[model samples]
Target chain A: EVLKLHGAWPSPFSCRVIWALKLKGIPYEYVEEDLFNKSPLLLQYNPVHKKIPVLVHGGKPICESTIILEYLDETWPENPLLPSDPHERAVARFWVKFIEDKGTAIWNIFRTKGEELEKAVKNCLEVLKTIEEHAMGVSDDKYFGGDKIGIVDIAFCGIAHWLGVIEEVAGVKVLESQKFPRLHAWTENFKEAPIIKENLPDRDQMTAFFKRRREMIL
Target chain B: EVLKLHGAWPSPFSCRVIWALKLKGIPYEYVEEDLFNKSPLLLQYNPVHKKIPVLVHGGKPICESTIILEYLDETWPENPLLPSDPHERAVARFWVKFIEDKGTAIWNIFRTKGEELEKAVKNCLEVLKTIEEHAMGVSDDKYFGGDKIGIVDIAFCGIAHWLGVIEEVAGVKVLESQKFPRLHAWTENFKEAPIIKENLPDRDQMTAFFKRRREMIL
Candidate 1:
């Protein structure tokens, strides 16, 4: 079965689909889309959100980043991105929801301005603290579900790469290693993953992308 | 196994757990919590947000409304709240995530000020439009899942009852039958489902309940 992924250029949301595809060794067509001028298929595939990171299997479209991840996992089932254990899977899904809801604000903050920008940065820090102090567990095991990059890790698509770009553009460092020790290790390990490393956007390119968008939006 | 649910009375978020339990025919103890003054157990179960709708299954606490729903579906698959088709399941989860993310604004509008209230109302209307236009499949087949009040119906727990209460309290009926005919119709059809109809809290009672709660919060 040919899987066609509808995604935009340089989106962390897009990279999430990439990382999962890479991990599963699923050979599919990567159809890059323009956010400014979205293709008809993009519009067709994701009408509700009209957003990126949509996975289409045999012409069926699955929107939502985390849902796409689970879709790929269930469809491929080769290199499992989620655990088989029901409880552990829920925990992974818990973090996936957590990052999706909380992490969006960080990107928005790094993308907006004035009092809102300040508030966004502050909000981002509070969220990071929550993930650092509460969400991520490190002492007992390495990865979110322990020693494996699962759905939860893919969900934190921003922190693994976009956070740095955000902090760089905002001229603020909310993710100091000492402050978020566990998340810091997770970040390094996350980037080191072959699938993640190979699929990540160029640093210089992302800096330019976010910087330009931030200027326009702010 | 001791099953205790910590939730505020008349919360659709709380109702999610209640519906799941009733559908699965699982017996559980319900602990009504005062939102303004949460108990230690509530705080302990969900330390991060200290939010309600925390489900304790054999002492393991699961926070987040949709996460609790997912946990319940996985833990007890008797009636099967979600569909079996992975593709179909992803679609159900997509709405579940959609509602869980946007559904909060309706509650926020209840407690927000003039400007924020306007924004919150706009936010909610957008959700209503999505459901009206996309989520609910019309014609001979009804409900988001085509037939049966499945995960998608459960996901929209708020609008089924709570929207009416907000409209009554706020003196603004956003979910008018005229504005959202199919959605308004679905709300009636959904609540009419035995699982939903039988287990749903008394509407007149809830009207009085949320009325008092909103007045105090606002």
Candidate 2:
């Protein structure tokens, strides 16, 4: 049974499944989709959300980025990305849900102008500060887990990889490196992982894409 | 080692745990809390969200209502609240996740005002309509699945009971008997189950409590 991943360019969420697949050494086909005019496969596969990062296996589609990651982990358990311990896995999923619900403000900042943007920035900072203090792994050098780049780490891919692109494109900075030292190092560490590093969007291409995209957004 | 549940008296979320414990024939201690001023144990147990129903087993707290449900299901397997097949279980969990995320607006009508309330009500209608049309199980028989109550039903406890209180307090009546006959019938079948019927908070008490709470909140 062949595996196919329907995804969009410059979406950090789709990168989550990419990282997991490569970490597990599972080979799969990547189909790039345009959000403005999504492919028919994307539509047929993910009729519910109609969003991407859909991992289609043996003609069945798995929707949602985190769900895709879980599917990959469970379907191919070698070199596990998630903690085998159920409680630890639950904790990882909890963080995934937390960041997903709260991470909107970070992106929302790019969608507004003037005072609204300021409020979004402040809200984003509150989210980041809490995450840095509470969930940035255990040590100064740790990315998310102390040593391994595990499930919780993969779940916050946007924070680790794409936030900088958004910040630059929005012509504003909220995730300041010095103030968020742990997070700063986290971004670097997360990016340095071979699978993530190998699979990320071309940095300049994504930057240019979002830069033009922000004109339509903000 | 005591099995204790921490939750507010009026919530259907607490009812989820109550039904699970009863289904498994596991007896537990119930500790009701005033949500406004949380008890010290509640605060200590779940500092993150500080919300109930937090299930404590041998003094270790498992927060998040859905996570607690999972903990219960795995910890005791005799009377499964979920289906036995892995794929069916995944589908059940998919609906569980969907309702948990999209069903928030179903309750927001009670806690909001002005256009916010209208928007929330609209969202609630859209979600209920989605469930009626495409939740894929309401068509077969009674609940989200045929023949037995399952996790999807438990996840939507808010709709069965608390939704009525919210509708009354917010001066909205959307779940008409004719409009959503299947959903309405499902609610009756769900609540009439012996475990659920015996363990719910008195409805009159809920109305009085939420009425006052709304007055304070609004």
Candidate 3:
């Protein structure tokens, strides 16, 4: 019962931890921390990266939200986040890595300018296209996997919630509904999941928040 | 044991798999492919990234070397790469990820020129500093995780073997022996291992190869 989550408020990364914990029905404490003025515990817990969505259990901290999800699934197996079959698990993991690597382009769109922003938006469109074509199965199942909210779906929390806000703030809509129909469909399907639907940051609040961030950075 | 590895000759990523399989005594058929003229199997195996070091087991391909290492660990399990304790495993993974995220600066030094090269070198120094301070346990564990040549060490095959070659080719030396004592020591310790020493690409051959690549790319 000694589970605690230290996460930044309104962070898609933090929401990843929240959704995973909620889906697993694991009880824990939540400590909202400032992204800029990070807590001593946050700094101490994650000395290397100094990033958030760190999960502390029994006085030990696990950093990186995706890695934390894997740890949680291994530690508490109820409502398994990943699949049992190794090959299927690899397939799930492939998309998670895909999301982690490609998802950066979306953020670049928010922060970069002119040529950089153009390149970022172009890269983002490619990412969306790849996901639309390949992420879902031939069954083109309910989710990235077959009829389950597996790891790939959870890993893509950023695109599900944050990207739309980013698109609004950046004023260049790479994730056009018409252009990426499947991924566009995925956003709705993913957000509608009970745990996700209940726990996501308010869209309007995030848009305002990110708009401010984009202004400051750019 | 239907294991097949599609790898580029000069890729440190490919060496990650080579070292891991050699460590575990797992027999894998190696298919060396040209990076530019990629094999049809390599293309089909990893369409997303279309990069090398694609591990195909029983005709199912797993892309990304770190993930491939994990798959090998799970499937083999005889000579374990990851630790048993979940927290320790998380700690191991944290460094592995730190290496992945921060280690790219080293490559940038090789591929960039003038002001960009200056920036890449500066970032590479910071990466070396962070690793020297944080990666080894406070007591200076022989490897990244307590004397075991585990996943983190394997993940950093670039720094251990290839970085030296890149430094020579790029006319830059971010990982100076006097500057980074621990990492310098780590290089000796890492390469001294017979499995790694025997399997790594020849340094002179790599220098000539990467020198040409750097010239072409820059």
Candidate 4:
């Protein structure tokens, strides 16, 4: 089974898929695409969104990082990314959808200006509050689900590492350690994981890339 | 094995779950709630989003209609809502997420006044165009996945029924049959499904409800 992944180097979305493949120990070739000038293969692979992180398995392309993660889990049952029980899986999925929906505000801080940016930051903080209060409970599990690093942890790669870089690049702060203690610790725990630690993109490079992108946006 | 579904009368989200339950021949007690004055049960069930179609099964609550549908499918394997094959399931899910993300703009038409409404209409049209072009291929199959009324079909219930009502309520026409032949046919075929035809909310009542709600928003 020939599995191939098409993605850009610096995208958190791409990072999540990469993490899933590595955690499952699935061997696949990677094709990095230039977002500014997207390759025809990327466009053809994901015509609807035309976005990065399209996982091609045996010549078939799977778009959306989360969808791809689920696909990988289903295709290769070893080293499960999601929980086994239906309710437990639903809860994991709930967090994934939650972060995917709410995490937009953090990204918006880099794209918006003035009042819009302020609103974005406010929304981002609210997201942090919700995650801290609800998503991550009193359980001392290192990951979102008990023990093993699962899909929800991968879903929140943005907050775990990228949010700080985004806050810095956008000249705003949302994921303060004092404000979101559970999420703060989770971020550290998430990064310290062997697969994630080895696989995450270079921080300095990400900061520089996003900073330049933010400057261009402004 | 008691199932309780808490949802509003006119929500397509709720309707999807209802359709899934009916299709699977799963008996569920429907508890209709007032959206304007949400019930404490609803809040307790779905604290994070507080949105409707919260499925309480044997005392445990499952939020998000799509997640609820998946839960139902997993819990009750008979009359499957989704495809069995991993790649096929991934394709089905890709469309579900596609519509879920892109379809939000259609609802925005109700809230916005001038420029925003126009932009919303434009985005809605684009959504229709994408669905018509990509989602609905040149297959004479009764539904998106095939002859059976699958999850993808349920995911697109809004576009099939609600879009026409929204266009009328918002005083803008987007899903014109001439423009979107495949999707128009899909709407007709989807509604003609025995389970769907029986379970759908009253059209006249939904129009009135949404019209009044739009009036409040505008």
Candidate 5:
């Protein structure tokens, strides 16, 4: 009878869970966590990481955004996030893991400067290039799992919104439209999805938040 | 009808797949790849990472060890690696992701020396400490998923075997039994399982291999 999500607005990981829940039409109580001063409940919910996007279902807490998404999918199978076929699911998971492992380069761009920032930009571009070439299809499928938004699409939400905001704040552009036409198109398609559009943090707000964060760190 | 595995003998990732296949009683031809000179088939099979433990089912390749384990369980559901319940499955996956993300610290011990090695050892011990305190049960359950050896156990195969071997080669012992009694006991139980016992890379051979690797890298 009770489902709750403790999440931060600016976190792409937190947004991933929000998108998953909304896509499935699952009713959830959202508690916006203050990352600067974490709530005791958030700390109790996720002791190991002490991070946000902890989905509490009937008193038990589920941590990690992707894991929470899978839990939500498994529990409420009405609108499936993963493919039905085993092989297709495996392919979907492969990309999710690839992004999870390599997507850090984008964040690195936000947190570095000078030659380090240049290297971070280069690395982030390489990750984008791999996604463009290896992960995507021949400009036909709208999403990573074709036609509809799926787990992979949710996983790559960072690439769609946060990357642009981070690019603007950091004064570097990595996801060039000409260089990555298919991926760029996929980003537009992704953001245009009603659930995603409504759930995402305001772009202007995120840009200001990230700009201050960058200045503080660098 | 056709199932094949492209892997290297010394890899714990390769062993994880082997254990899963053997436990499921699935028959597949195994090709030991020379990682120094990766095979054309291997490259063709896995263009993304181009790394091993690639399980080929009906000619389609599945890369990444944990993903392959999940795929194997889905395809051949006889010996289920995950729990039937959604929450339990999420719990299992949480531990697997924890290991995958933090377990690299153990390997960092192998590749590093001097003060860096000391830092790596401390980091690895912290990882081990987390697994011991947060993940394990209160002294009774033999495996991560209760009585049966599930995907979490397989994900932790590196900790049970490779950690010890790496410690020997690197001349640093991080997984002391007294400090992590529950995890230490679990490792013993994991190794003694029939499929794992039968399919593991020879200890002496691994020791020598890692010793040379350490020497070369240093």
Candidate 6:
């Protein structure tokens, strides 16, 4: 089984695939992509979006980070990212979709300024609050799908890692520990996971990169 | 097995679930929801995003239309919405994600006006063109997955049904048959499917509803 992941390191989307591959112990080639000057292979692999983090397994490309993750889970079937039970899988998927659908608000904070930034921050807070209140369970220590870190946890990887960098760069904070304790706890727990800890992009590097990006966008 | 679907008739999202359940031959109770005044059960079932089509199975609620579709497919293995092969399933999911991520652009055409409407139309056209060129295969008779209607086909149900209504209500057209012949053919082929033909909302009713909605928005 030949597996090659085309991705950029700074991207949380790329990191999600990396973490899943590492956790599942799937050995594969990692090709670092230049998003500014995308490779023809990346374009061919993901023609629709022409985006990165395309997992080419046996030369069949899978695009979209979450979709790729699902593909990985389905194909590998060991150390499953998704649960065994159908209903449990649906619940996991529900939260995954929830975070995914609302993710742009958090991203908009990094990409916008002034009133737009304020609105982004507001929307981000609402999303975080909803996750804290509704998505996360009573237990603070367990992951989204109980003890093991599953797809929902992987889906929220951005909030765990990138959101802080974005918050610092944008000079705004929406995920306060007091306001969103469950989310705060989840973030801490998620980052501490062995595979995630080993695979995460350097915070200082991300901060520097996103700072430049923020400057460029502004 | 007790299955109750909480949904509104006009929603393409709701209709996706309805189609999947019908195809799977699952016995389900249908509950119509008023979007203007959502039921408390709807809020309780889907607190994070208090939106329907929530599929309640054995009293447990499942939210989000696509998620619900997957749940239905998983719980009932007969007449599968997803393909059997993992790679094929990945490919199917990739298109599903593609259409879903781009679906808002089509809806925006209905919701905006003037310059905004022009931008929406442009974006919607790009989405449709991508589907026409990349998503739909060479053979027009086959659905997104081949022969049988599957998840990707269900995901693009809006493009097949609602886009026409939205065009009429907004008094603009982007899915021209000449430009998007494959997409046009697929839409015709998809609508003609026995289950879909019977399940879709009344065109006249949708036009009137969207006309009133456009009036309110304007």
TM-score for each of the candidates: 0.93, 0.91, 0.93, 0.96, 0.98, 0.95
Chain A TM-score of model 3 comes to 0.96
lDDT of 2 at A162: 78
Task: Give the top-scoring candidate (DockQ).
Answer: 5
| Candidate 6 C-alpha error for residue A180, in Å | 1.3
lDDT tens digits, residue span A88-204, model 1 = 777677778778777767676686667877788888878888888778763577667466678888888688788888889878777889988888888888888777788888988
User: What TM-score quantifies how close candidate 4 is to the native fold?
Assistant: 0.96
Question: Model 2, range A69-173, lDDT digits (tens) per residue?
Answer: 766666777777677655556566678778877879768876777888888888999988877766655445465654677877888888877777877877789
Name the lDDT of candidate 5: 0.91
What is each model's TM-score for chain A?
0.93, 0.93, 0.96, 0.97, 0.97, 0.97
Error of 3 at A33 (Å): 0.6
Complex DockQ per candidate: 0.73, 0.38, 0.67, 0.86, 0.87, 0.83
Q: How well docked is model 6, in DockQ terms?
A: 0.83
lDDT of 1: 0.81
- Mark the regions of model 2 whose C-alpha exceeds 4 Å error after superposition: A137-146, B112-118, B138-141
lDDT score of residue A175 within candidate 2:
85
State the lDDT of candidate 3 residue by residue for B164-185, as single tens digits.
8888888877888899998889
lDDT of 3 by residue, A1-218 (tens): 58999987788788889989998889999998887788899999988778898999998889999899989888888888888887778788888877877768778888988898889999888988888877766776767745768788889888888888888888887778898878888889999978879898899998998889888997
Off by over 4 Å in 3: A112-119, A215-218, B113-115
Stretch of 10 with least lDDT, candidate 6 chain A:
A137-146
Candidate 1 lDDT over residue span B1-218, tens digit each: 89989887777888888887887788899989888788888887777888889888789888877877777777787777788899889988988887877878788767776788888888888889987888866356656656666778888878888888877777666888998998898889888887889888887898777788788877
List residue ranges in candidate 6 displaced over 4 A. B138-141
True contacts kept of 3: 0.59
Q: Which of 1 and 4 is ahead in lDDT?
A: 4
The whole-model lDDT of each prediction reads 0.81, 0.78, 0.85, 0.88, 0.91, 0.88
TM-score of chain B of 1: 0.90
Question: What is the fnat score of candidate 1?
Answer: 0.81
Model 1 chain A weakest 10-residue run by lDDT: A137-146
